[PDB]
Symmetry: C3
Subunit: 31 residues, 3 copies
Amino acid sequence: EVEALEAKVEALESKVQKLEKKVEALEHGWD
Amino acid sequence: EVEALEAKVEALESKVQKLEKKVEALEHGWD
Amino acid sequence: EVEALEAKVEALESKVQKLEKKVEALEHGWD
């Protein structure tokens, strides 16, 4: 379960980073 | 603590999925 | 690894909450 957790967490970190980049672009009016 | 973690992670997956849907709508101009 | 996980999860909760606040502002047209 722990190694199952590590994978879910790593999957979340990737998605949260993509979301942060998207939201920054929208907040800043980039492009 | 592990079963405490599993719950926090599952709570995060739900919120991250809602955020992804919201950001896609905003990025795409849906509706 | 478990205490490593707890930290990553807590870091994620903080970022997900900031993202939720940002997206709500954008969705609502706040300010």
